[PDB]
Design an enzyme around this catalytic site. Sequence first.
Site, PDB file in Angstrom:
ATOM      1  N   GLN A  43      28.308  38.952  62.166  1.00  0.00           N
ATOM      2  CA  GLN A  43      27.382  40.059  62.396  1.00  0.00           C
ATOM      3  C   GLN A  43      27.700  40.901  63.643  1.00  0.00           C
ATOM      4  O   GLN A  43      27.293  42.060  63.730  1.00  0.00           O
ATOM      5  CB  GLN A  43      25.919  39.572  62.407  1.00  0.00           C
ATOM      6  CG  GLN A  43      25.606  38.440  63.379  1.00  0.00           C
ATOM      7  CD  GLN A  43      24.134  38.027  63.369  1.00  0.00           C
ATOM      8  OE1 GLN A  43      23.773  36.977  62.839  1.00  0.00           O
ATOM      9  NE2 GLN A  43      23.283  38.845  63.982  1.00  0.00           N
TER      10      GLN A  43
ATOM     11  N   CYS B 165      21.378  39.567  60.988  1.00  0.00           N
ATOM     12  CA  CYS B 165      21.466  38.255  60.387  1.00  0.00           C
ATOM     13  C   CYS B 165      20.629  38.170  59.096  1.00  0.00           C
ATOM     14  O   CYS B 165      20.934  37.372  58.206  1.00  0.00           O
ATOM     15  CB  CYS B 165      21.078  37.183  61.410  1.00  0.00           C
ATOM     16  SG  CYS B 165      19.373  37.229  61.947  1.00  0.00           S
TER      17      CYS B 165
ATOM     18  N   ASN C 148      26.330  30.514  58.398  1.00  0.00           N
ATOM     19  CA  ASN C 148      25.861  31.460  59.394  1.00  0.00           C
ATOM     20  C   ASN C 148      26.756  32.688  59.377  1.00  0.00           C
ATOM     21  O   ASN C 148      27.805  32.674  58.750  1.00  0.00           O
ATOM     22  CB  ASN C 148      25.871  30.811  60.767  1.00  0.00           C
ATOM     23  CG  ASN C 148      24.972  31.528  61.744  1.00  0.00           C
ATOM     24  OD1 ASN C 148      24.560  32.664  61.509  1.00  0.00           O
ATOM     25  ND2 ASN C 148      24.637  30.855  62.843  1.00  0.00           N
TER      26      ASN C 148
ATOM     27  N   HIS D 137      16.654  33.165  63.725  1.00  0.00           N
ATOM     28  CA  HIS D 137      17.898  33.437  63.030  1.00  0.00           C
ATOM     29  C   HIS D 137      17.757  33.181  61.529  1.00  0.00           C
ATOM     30  O   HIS D 137      17.202  32.155  61.118  1.00  0.00           O
ATOM     31  CB  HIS D 137      19.003  32.556  63.612  1.00  0.00           C
ATOM     32  CG  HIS D 137      20.389  33.029  63.310  1.00  0.00           C
ATOM     33  ND1 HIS D 137      20.728  34.365  63.262  1.00  0.00           N
ATOM     34  CD2 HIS D 137      21.532  32.345  63.072  1.00  0.00           C
ATOM     35  CE1 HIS D 137      22.018  34.484  63.014  1.00  0.00           C
ATOM     36  NE2 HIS D 137      22.529  33.273  62.894  1.00  0.00           N
TER      37      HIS D 137
END
Length: 215
Positions: free
Chosen positions: A19, A25, A182, A162
């Site tokens: 990102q 995110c 992630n 997150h």
Amino acid sequence: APDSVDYRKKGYVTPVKNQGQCGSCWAFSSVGALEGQLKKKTGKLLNLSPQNLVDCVSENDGCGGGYMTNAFQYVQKNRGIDSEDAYPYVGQEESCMYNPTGKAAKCRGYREIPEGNEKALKRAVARVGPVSVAIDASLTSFQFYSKGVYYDESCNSDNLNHAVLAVGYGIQKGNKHWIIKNSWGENWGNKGYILMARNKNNACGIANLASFPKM
Ligand SMILES: *[C@@](=O)([N][N]C(=O)[C]([C][C]([C])[C])[N]C(=O)O[C]C1=[C][C]=[C][C]=[C]1)[N][N]C(=O)C1=[C]C(O[C]C2=[C][C]=[C][C]=[C]2)=[C][C]=[C]1
């Protein structure tokens, strides 16, 4: 094998992205969900545009943050989302440059998972595929994660900051876990992923804001 599922081996998960300095995110996690479904139905996988979401989902704050449910709702109302190549990621807000000619997917709604119900999450990932989740990744232990099954009793299920994507679930050295993807690059944690604890009383709020799009 017992009750374990990893969509990575299946081809439902695209390469790990980064990102950057933008707080998108939520856009990456949503795209992850959409992508997982696009494989499920189409039989072919494709990188969807996270930027497209960042620039067009007026209900969210672009690089300031947003919710996955709002992103799905956008793709539905708009009837389509561009592929990465069609609408590249630059890591910052700009004017929505949606290209109808570049549409590569669409959806007809979403279904939030029961707030705080891990088991309903295991089934959702088992019967649907990658699920968009929201966890607490403020602790350094999470940030410098390298291997094994993460679990920190200081994690706060109420502080969901997150947004990630649950690619599956399984067992380790006796530890059940949720395979997490992630958006910090292939250079973070375990080649971009992280094994978080499963059934450890909703560790980090993994099942506190889950959802997935319908195709
Ligand atoms: C994301 O960048 N921003 N997250 C959110 O906006 C999410 C949205 C989803 C709904 C989860 N959180 C949220 O909306 O919280 C609301 C809430 C709270 C409690 C209950 C219910 C709802 N998250 N960012 C971070 O963790 C973070 C990320 C960066 O990124 C930079 C970077 C990229 C690559 C490598 C290294 C660094 C920076 C700081 C923090």
